[PDB]
Design a protein around this ligand. Structure first.
Ligand code: W04
Length: 165
């Protein structure tokens, strides 16, 4: 199971780890992707997860979009986890760099409550432009299921732990 995590709350855990390497190791039931509404997995966590699936995540995602249309910001869909996990929960946090409403971050985290345990990144962090400290706060205050957060950047991980209220 999950190892080396620091416990932040009753249900939230955090580790300085590459979520792809973490998923390959644990093979969790659910890995969360930091998706966009089009499921175009170009960069950040999505580009890294998709590259680890040899683009199978993108091929599956294109078929999903062709059938269903785009997701909503704050929404999600469950697709295959491919070689990384049983399922991938593609969750769309607001992209501050696209001028999207940061208030949608709580709605994005609410998707995690449909799964008992998840391996996840901080939503809207990184290339999505939100403050990762704020994302962790919304995560702790929204998610009630067991969430194992993988933070790639060591310097950000240290800042998140040291500033955690
Ligand atoms: C291509 N490098 C892998 C990578 O960026 N992995 C990652 C990224 C974030 C933001 C969180 C956890 N893991």
């Amino acid at each position: 199971s999950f190892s080396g995590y620091l416990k932040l709350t009753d249900n939230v855990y955090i580790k300085n780890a590459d979520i792809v390497e973490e998923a390959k190791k644990v093979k969790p039931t659910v890995v969360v992707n930091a998706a966009n509404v089009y499921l175009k997995h170009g960069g950040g966590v999505a580009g890294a997860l998709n590259k680890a699936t040899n683009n199978a995540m993108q091929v599956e995602s294109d078929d999903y979009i062709a059938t269903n249309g785009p997701l909503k910001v704050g929404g999600s869909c469950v697709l295959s986890g491919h070689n990384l996990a049983k399922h991938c929960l593609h969750v769309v946090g607001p992209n501050v760099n696209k001028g999207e409403d940061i208030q949608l971050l709580k709605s994005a985290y609410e998707n995690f409550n449909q799964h008992e345990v998840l391996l996840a990144p901080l939503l809207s962090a990184g290339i999505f432009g939100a403050d990762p400290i704020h994302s962790l706060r919304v995560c702790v205050d929204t998610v009630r299921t067991n969430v194992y957060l993988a933070v790639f950047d060591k310097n950000l991980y240290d800042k998140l732990v040291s500033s955690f209220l």
